């Protein structure tokens, strides 16, 4: 089976660092009034673009392409927002109190109030960001986390053929492999055996919080889509209809 299962921690890290998507710039007009409808159009335009690149990145995560088309679709429908979010918190690490949606779009808690029920979500994102800063998360660790999200998010929500069993089996093997890689990074960094376990745990626990933020964000996005402040972006709307 899968070639992903025969990579060395270092090849694994290499693969993921290589798969990294480009950092997009917002394509907007700064001379337009901050409003619920303009903001939502800004964030939502960016997100839609990032999803195209996201799909390319997923194809490069070891073990991903070995999955059926249907399972690949499921995984992405089930994790696209967690992924956009962890990516957000990551590049917002070096920007206390601010969210760096793009290199040319750094917003802060207060510009979030611009949209209804948005600030709470901004606070959560910022909280996560602070936590990563506090923990001094490494880029090698970051990419291992994002992959764990892509593979772990929708696996307990597949279906039930004999095929699906082999799929879930495969996924868990790749997840274990990635855990091996995180520990390897941590050991090489010089942490003791105890520090390794504790950190591994701390990072994985942050993932359930990201999942939570994802759920709130879906609800929010969907509500904004009821107020009619979300442009009809084909891909984003599709991914949002998944749930």
């Amino acid at each position: 089976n899968s070639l992903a299962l025969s990579l060395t921690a270092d090849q694994m890290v290499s693969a993921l660092l290589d798969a990294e998507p480009p950092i997009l710039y917002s394509e907007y007009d700064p001379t337009r009034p901050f409003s619920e409808a303009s903001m939502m159009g800004l964030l939502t335009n960016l997100a839609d673009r990032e999803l195209v690149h996201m799909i390319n990145w997923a194809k490069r995560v070891p073990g991903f392409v070995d999955l059926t088309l249907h399972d690949q679709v499921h995984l992405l429908e089930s994790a696209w927002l967690e992924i956009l979010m962890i990516g957000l918190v990551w590049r917002s690490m070096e920007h206390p109190g601010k969210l760096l949606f793009a290199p040319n779009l750094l917003l802060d808690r207060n510009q979030g109030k611009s949209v209804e029920g948005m600030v709470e979500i901004f606070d959560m994102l910022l909280a996560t960001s602070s936590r990563f800063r506090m923990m001094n998360l490494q880029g090698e660790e970051f990419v291992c986390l994002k992959s764990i999200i892509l593979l772990n998010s929708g696996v307990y929500t597949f279906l039930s053929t004999l095929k699906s069993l082999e799929e879930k089996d495969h996924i868990h093997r790749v997840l274990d492999k990635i855990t091996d890689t995180l520990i390897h990074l941590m050991a090489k960094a010089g942490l003791t055996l105890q520090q390794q376990h504790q950190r591994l745990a701390q990072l994985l626990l942050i993932l359930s919080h990201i999942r939570h933020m994802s759920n709130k964000g879906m609800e929010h996005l969907y509500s904004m889509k009821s107020k009619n402040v979300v442009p009809l972006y084909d891909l984003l709307l599709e991914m949002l209809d998944a749930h």
Partner: peptide, 9 residues
């Protein structure tokens, strides 16, 4: 009705 599978396929 099918954007994701196209880009994936």
């Amino acid at each position: 009705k099918x954007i994701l599978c196209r880009l994936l396929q």
